[PDB]
Assembly symmetry: C3
Homo-oligomer: 172 residues x 3
């Protein structure tokens, strides 16, 4: 959304430019791109960026993709804490059954590699290498190019800065 780029402060000049460039990515297909932007937007917790990106994503994303993306952010919202936490514990708790329902990862109602690309994205924002690596591994295993994986990473980061540049406006 142009309204999103325009809300950005002058001292967040690079963010705006990175945002504009990422919106024009030739590395990812439309669903992969916008789903990453939308899933990333959700993980920033910034309602502003989610609204605009969500609004902009409506003509690149079917209702299915849109939902699965938000769903990605929600499930990773749980997974990035559990796995990361278990990951800091050296394995000591690996023998226990998590007992966490996470079916959406099994059937996201949309092509798998996309939901993974988006979980990868969110996992990067929340900062859980355990989930980031597993997905980055599955992505390569299913044939997603390194270039595309990197783009999603870039997309996750640009959107984090965007959200952050916005929140910084709370100083009139």
């Amino acid at each position: 959304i142009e309204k999103l780029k325009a809300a950005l402060p002058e001292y967040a000049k690079d963010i705006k430019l990175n945002l504009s460039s990422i919106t024009r990515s030739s590395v990812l297909d439309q669903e992969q791109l916008w789903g990453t932007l939308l899933a990333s937007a959700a993980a920033t917790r910034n309602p502003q960026v989610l609204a605009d990106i969500g609004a902009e994503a409506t003509d690149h994303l079917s209702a299915a993709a849109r939902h699965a993306a938000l769903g990605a952010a929600a499930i990773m919202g749980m997974n990035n804490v559990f796995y990361r936490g278990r990951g800091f514990l050296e394995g000591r708790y690996d023998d226990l059954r998590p007992g966490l329902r996470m079916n959406i990862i099994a059937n996201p109602g949309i092509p798998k590699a996309n939901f993974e690309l988006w979980s990868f994205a969110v996992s990067a924002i929340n900062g859980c290498s355990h989930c980031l690596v597993a997905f980055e591994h599955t992505l390569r295993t299913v044939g997603v190019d390194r270039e595309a994986i990197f783009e999603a990473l870039k997309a996750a980061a640009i959107v984090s800065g965007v959200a952050q540049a916005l929140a910084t406006i709370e100083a009139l």
Copy 2:
């Protein structure tokens, strides 16, 4: 947590299902459990999740544990940043006195165990290995089931998922 559950979107079904079960756990006593949910809810910093959960954690906790649960999230909001950053600095800042008051760690109106448990839960949410690791160690030495510690970790992550999902609908509805 009746309010939250119904608020959750169907694309967040797994979160819904997970919330409703964690609230019915029986591996952690009423104090250990609700303190975790509360300290967890606070640490997610989602007004909604904290309210609902808080409004219910009340008829499960003495006023001492509540304050303690809430203060655990708050103090660790500081500690988790200081200890992590210091941890990343090649040990070059290990001999310095932090000059950070944290009398609350000298524990509140409750026994150092639940609080250690709640600080554990908050550290997982904040992503601080140093603190997470230390509390897990201290919790065992004290005689706390690894399955309980494990349950606190799940409750923390679940609550995080609730926060994330709820923050989304409230920004799109």
Copy 3:
């Protein structure tokens, strides 16, 4: 400061006491200290704390300082996600040309060492060792004793506790 401080919960007295002491410290410049407090306050994403800290920052910092300090939180919000990500992928992508605009870092409207200290502080908040470690290395190089660097870290943690404590009262405040 007094307002924010006064607004904090009874279960956050250490935070209150730490905010107060950190604000009245003398290890860092007035520009170093308030640039850090604001960069930090911004990194917590709490509207109230940014507003209160952003307010008082007007009489301790110059507009440029504040712009650049908020800009540090902004670019670090991107970089901290990127480099940490690369970190988890064990450098497997260190050879793909990030292609991300930054510049501000090379040309802040203020002395670099201060922008670095603030970036260092923000990185501490977001949790990116790569950036933290990197800004740390540069700081020490051009001076700034570990005493100064250590203070900013402290400040970031304290402002981090503030946000958390404030957020729970606002959310738990009657009706």
